[PDB]
């Protein structure tokens, strides 16, 4: 969804990431108590789960597009 | 143009069944929707016609599947209530 | 309890978690009335020096 064409397609294509946002929100606590966070040019294939978590959180809270449109409730 | 409800037009049996119709000017028994599952199925249908047209076949299938699952859970809960009130 | 059958560990952990929840609640009521602006933190720096490790429900539990 952070690809440009998908971003412009968003409304027409009905591409909603609410499921992924909610899943990350519900899994934060389990990942926090997970003991294997640091047991580890690519943009997806990253070997460390904490690196993956920062990529997810950066995409959610600080998206490249519409950075000044993020819901304050989500941010808080 | 005048409404089919205003005009005394009889109901006609088609592929969509008329069912057991109710006599005119009499007590149409009120069935109440206060269950969380019944609200879920009505809500799922409402959101279906609100969203409408989807290009993705899998997305359309998932919309239909969530409506089907809502109906399945409603039927299960109603049958369970029937059993509960028939035995105990 | 959907494992093992170790009811001893089960009861020990259930009482542990109950006391942890009670202590968290206790902190809720005594912290609900503390001002913590980011340029004024006198109350939080003077929060609970005057209470000893046996008054808390978890203190009673541990002792």
């Amino acid at each position: 969804l952070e690809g440009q064409d998908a971003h412009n397609a968003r409304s027409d294509l009905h591409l909603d990431l609410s499921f992924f946002i909610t899943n990350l929100y519900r899994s934060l606590l389990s990942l926090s108590l997970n003991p294997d966070l640091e047991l580890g040019n690519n943009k997806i294939n990253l070997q460390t789960t904490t690196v993956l978590l920062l990529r997810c959180l950066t995409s959610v809270l600080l998206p490249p597009w519409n950075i000044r449109s993020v819901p304050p409730i989500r941010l808080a | 143009v005048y409404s089919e409800k205003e005009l005394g037009i009889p109901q006609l049996n088609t592929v969509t069944p008329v069912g057991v119709t109710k006599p005119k000017g009499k007590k149409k028994g009120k069935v109440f929707v206060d269950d969380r599952e019944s609200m879920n199925t009505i809500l799922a249908m409402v959101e279906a016609e609100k969203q409408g047209q989807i290009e993705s076949k899998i997305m359309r299938a998932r919309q239909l599947e969530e409506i089907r699952e809502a109906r399945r859970i409603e039927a299960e809960k109603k049958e369970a209530e029937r059993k509960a009130l028939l035995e105990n | 309890r959907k494992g093992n059958k170790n009811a001893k560990l089960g009861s020990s952990l259930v009482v542990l978690v109950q006391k942890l929840e009670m202590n968290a609640k206790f902190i809720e009521e005594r912290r609900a009335k503390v001002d913590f602006a980011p340029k004024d933190r006198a109350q939080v720096d003077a929060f609970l020096k005057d209470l000893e490790w046996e008054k808390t429900p978890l203190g009673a539990y541990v002792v």
């Binding site: 409304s11 | 009120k30 069935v31 109440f32 929707v33 206060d34 969380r36 019944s38 609200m39 879920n40 009505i42 809500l43 249908m45 409402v46 959101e47 609100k50 | -």
Partner: protein, 177 residues
């Protein structure tokens, strides 16, 4: 007081989905094993807690005047209409929302239609006749309505041109005083 029937629930949820995105959020269970339910007193629908409805059951029907939040009224012909009392729930779950300046917020509070001369922020990709909750520049829930044109048409529209049609504003609290 009584629960809503199937047709009544369908109509109420049709209006509510016309103005909102998520409705399972409204009917979802809470932490204490409680949920929000729908009730009807006289010709008005009330969005209420189940616990509150059950505890208010003891009040006589002719002496119960309000309960929870008044969501609207079912008309004589069987049509549901929302209210400025129902504005808050639309605020938590608004689909389309339009911001106005102070010089347009005061007219809207007087009961006028929103104009692009009053608008100061838009919602991108808004269909012609959709559901838009009207805010001021301080994100204060001010009202709700249906917009008259799409975003592109409103942008290319005359500065003195109707963009949204008013249905409810916060000035009705000065009606019922």
């Amino acid at each position: 007081m009584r629960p809503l029937t199937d047709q009544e629930m369908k109509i109420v949820l049709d209006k509510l989905a016309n103005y909102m995105t998520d409705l399972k959020s409204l009917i979802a269970p809470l932490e204490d094993g409680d949920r929000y339910v729908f009730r009807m007193q006289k010709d008005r629908v009330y969005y209420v807690k189940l616990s509150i409805a059950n505890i208010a059951t003891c009040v006589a029907r002719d002496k119960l005047l309000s309960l929870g939040t008044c969501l609207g009224k079912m008309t004589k012909s069987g049509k549901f209409r929302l209210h400025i009392t129902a504005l808050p729930i639309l605020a938590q779950n608004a689909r389309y929302k339009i911001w106005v300046k102070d010089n347009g917020a005061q007219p809207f509070l007087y009961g006028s239609n929103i104009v692009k001369a009053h608008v100061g922020r838009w919602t991108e990709d808004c269909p012609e006749h959709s559901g838009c909750v009207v805010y001021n520049m301080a994100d204060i829930p001010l009202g709700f309505g249906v917009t008259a044109r799409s975003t592109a048409e409103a942008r290319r529209l005359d500065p003195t041109g109707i963009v949204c049609f008013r249905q409810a504003d916060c000035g009705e609290y000065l009606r019922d005083e």
